[PDB]
Amino acid sequence: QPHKRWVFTLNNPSEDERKKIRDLPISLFDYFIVGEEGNEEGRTPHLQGFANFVKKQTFNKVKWYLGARCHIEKAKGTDQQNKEYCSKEGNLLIECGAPRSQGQRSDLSTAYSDYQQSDPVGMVLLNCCPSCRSSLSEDYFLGILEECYRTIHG
Amino acid sequence: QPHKRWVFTLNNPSEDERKKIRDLPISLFDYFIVGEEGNEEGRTPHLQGFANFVKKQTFNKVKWYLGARCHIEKAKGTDQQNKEYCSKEGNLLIECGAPRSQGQRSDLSTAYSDYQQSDPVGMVLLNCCPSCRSSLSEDYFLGILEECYRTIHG
């Protein structure tokens, strides 16, 4: 059976295996995060990753995209919990997209009339899906853009 | 059978029926557009709408969210073609969300390495769904935010 959500490990990645994963077209994924782990000489160097594909993929398809030596399993838990797990050693190879938010414990209004057409940031948030809106409402780079807009229109 | 993608018509909407549809939580939809049509004195005033729900909905559930009086049918065509159809008389009741692009075409790079961490706009586009990215890369309000950032950092 195919699924959209997969976790994976690759032990001792080569330069070329890292480049393959980093060169995957970002159009494949709703969300994708690959962390590089085990740099310390005690342990095994390895990629730790989570892919939420736009459409369901067979096991074989996932092997092709990530590489034949990857150990691949159906993902358990929330996109958010997988984000935290794959980023806990602070060294990302690639991160594209935004985690899917299944239980929407957002702080963010669900009322169309609270999004003011005089607020570009608010309009950016209005004009994307529930998962992307929730992620972008906390995004550092959208926060920079908000700060520049406030500076000029203040 | 349930589906994400539905079109609808409501003839002679009351004030209250319009307010119901405008008060729908924006968390329900990947994309939602309702236009108000038939203003001219010859014809019947009516809502013309398209909903792409986050999860699949039965006919009965769609009736619950919209009107019971709404005529509802499964959607055919792309989200984009439905957006153009529902906006052709220039008077939106509500639009919230971004159309789902089935890969279609983008002109936007699919290479992670073309999104520069020194570019906040580029990082906003990187950090979202492939469908939200394509839609936001043409968004008027993200364009205003780009313009303010360039003003300050040019």
From Swiss-Prot, chains A, B:
<feature type="binding site">
    <location>
        <position position="46"/>
    </location>
    <ligand>
        <name>a divalent metal cation</name>
    </ligand>
</feature>
<protein>
    <recommendedName>
        <fullName>Replication-associated protein</fullName>
    </recommendedName>
</protein>
<comment type="function">
    <text>Essential for the replication of viral ssDNA. The closed circular ssDNA genome is first converted to a superhelical dsDNA. Rep and/or Rep' binds a specific hairpin at the genome origin of replication. Introduces an endonucleolytic nick within the conserved sequence 5'-AGTATTAC-3' in the intergenic region of the genome, thereby initiating the rolling circle replication (RCR). Following cleavage, binds covalently to the 5'-phosphate of DNA as a tyrosyl ester. The cleavage gives rise to a free 3'-OH that serves as a primer for the cellular DNA polymerase.</text>
</comment>
<feature type="binding site">
    <location>
        <position position="37"/>
    </location>
    <ligand>
        <name>a divalent metal cation</name>
    </ligand>
</feature>
<feature type="domain" description="CRESS-DNA virus Rep endonuclease">
    <location>
        <begin position="1"/>
        <end position="99"/>
    </location>
</feature>
<feature type="region of interest" description="Disordered">
    <location>
        <begin position="1"/>
        <end position="18"/>
    </location>
</feature>
<feature type="active site" description="For DNA cleavage activity">
    <location>
        <position position="85"/>
    </location>
</feature>
<comment type="subunit">
    <text>Interacts with the capsid protein; this interaction relocates Rep into the nucleus.</text>
</comment>
<feature type="short sequence motif" description="RCR-1">
    <location>
        <begin position="7"/>
        <end position="10"/>
    </location>
</feature>
<feature type="binding site">
    <location>
        <position position="89"/>
    </location>
    <ligand>
        <name>a divalent metal cation</name>
    </ligand>
</feature>
<feature type="short sequence motif" description="RCR-3">
    <location>
        <begin position="85"/>
        <end position="88"/>
    </location>
</feature>
<feature type="short sequence motif" description="RCR-2">
    <location>
        <begin position="46"/>
        <end position="48"/>
    </location>
</feature>
<comment type="similarity">
    <text>Belongs to the nanoviruses/circoviruses replication-associated protein family.</text>
</comment>
